[PDB]
């Protein structure tokens, strides 16, 4: 039902800029066990590689972290009180390293025990934007059953499900731009 491929989106230039940061993304991905291509994909989608991007919501920087939510979440994962400042989120290394942490948090928490890497990946990008909870809720009210129900799908049926079930239009959209972004990235030798 969500017309999620319209308009088309040219990954080239936003991935090009995102790729500026790939050395950090490589290090960040490595440290947190996150696919560096995913990190770069997210940077390209959320900020188009612009480290000073700032949303209506006051989400900040390359990976559009919000200090009160994902910021706070990552601070607690590291044993820290409080939230990162705006200033620290505009730092490209701290920002990316924090997005990586946050992706790791989603993978080892809300989304734990997804089998297929590719669905996992799609789940991450939709969770990252519009929240793991809202995603699971589209399957079932109980987490464990929603996850069993996700493992009964392959990536394309997952995308179909998000397209028809997720309230947020940007959820399936992100999966489309993920794939455009991964395509642009084959033109960059690791």
């Amino acid at each position: 039902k969500h017309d999620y491929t319209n308009p088309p989106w040219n990954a080239k230039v936003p991935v090009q800029r995102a790729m500026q940061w790939m050395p950090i993304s490589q290090k960040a991905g490595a440290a947190w066990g996150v696919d560096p291509q995913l990190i770069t994909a997210i940077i390209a989608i959320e900020s188009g590689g612009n480290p000073n991007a700032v949303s209506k919501s006051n989400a900040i920087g390359l990976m559009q972290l919000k200090a009160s939510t994902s910021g706070r979440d990552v601070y607690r994962r590291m044993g820290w009180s409080g939230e990162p400042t705006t200033s620290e989120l505009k730092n490209p290394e701290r920002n990316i390293s924090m997005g990586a942490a946050y992706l790791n948090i989603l993978e080892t928490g809300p989304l734990a025990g997804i089998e297929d890497p590719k669905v996992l990946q799609y789940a991450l990008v939709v969770s990252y934007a519009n929240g793991a909870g809202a995603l699971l809720r589209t399957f079932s009210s109980d987490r464990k059953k929603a996850i069993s129900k996700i493992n009964d799908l392959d990536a394309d049926e997952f995308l179909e499900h998000v397209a028809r079930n997720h309230p947020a239009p940007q959820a399936p959209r992100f999966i489309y731009k993920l794939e455009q972004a991964l395509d642009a990235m084959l033109e960059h030798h690791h």
Side-chain angles (χ1 to χ4, degrees):
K1 184 280 278 67
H2 280 318
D3 191 3
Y4 61 97
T5 56
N6 153 33
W9 175 78
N10 181 256
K12 179 175 215 78
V13 51
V15 164
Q16 182 183 338
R17 312 180 164 159
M19 276 289 307
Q20 190 147 25
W21 308 106
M22 170 60 99
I24 302 158
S25 313
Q26 208 71 32
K27 273 171 35 197
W32 287 102
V34 175
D35 194 358
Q37 291 214 139
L38 179 53
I39 288 150
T40 31
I42 286 161
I43 299 166
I45 299 160
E46 277 269 41
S47 80
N50 172 1
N52 298 319
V54 176
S55 82
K56 296 149 289 314
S57 307
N58 235 17
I60 314 296
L62 285 176
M63 295 208 68
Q64 289 282 293
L65 290 189
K66 167 140 214 206
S68 56
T69 59
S70 21
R72 183 57 209 125
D73 290 346
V74 168
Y75 269 31
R76 44 189 187 246
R77 169 60 187 98
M78 270 146 44
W80 296 354
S81 61
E83 355 175 289
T85 57
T86 286
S87 216
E88 181 153 281
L89 292 171
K90 279 181 181 144
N91 184 289
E93 171 184 86
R94 288 330 176 80
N95 178 286
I96 287 172
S97 80
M98 285 189 52
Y102 181 69
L103 282 163
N104 176 278
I105 283 165
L106 293 169
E107 185 206 333
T108 63
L111 305 168
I114 298 186
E115 264 187 19
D116 187 1
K118 197 59 151 97
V119 180
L120 178 52
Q121 161 173 108
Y122 277 14
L124 280 174
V125 67
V126 154
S127 289
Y128 188 90
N130 306 96
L135 166 66
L136 302 207
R137 261 187 278 161
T138 66
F139 292 97
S140 110
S141 19
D142 170 16
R143 170 170 301 176
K144 188 215 164 98
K145 270 199 166 213
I147 271 200
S148 172
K149 297 229 289 175
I150 277 174
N151 283 310
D152 290 310
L153 303 185
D154 63 316
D156 292 78
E157 291 182 310
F158 184 95
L159 166 55
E160 187 46 40
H161 168 92
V162 163
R164 281 201 38 243
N165 292 326
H166 203 292
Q170 290 309 296
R173 184 89 181 139
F174 262 55
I175 296 182
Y176 159 75
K177 292 174 136 178
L178 173 58
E179 280 291 21
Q180 297 305 276
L182 292 161
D183 282 351
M185 288 175 69
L186 300 150
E187 303 311 355
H188 290 95
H189 313 94
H190 73 213

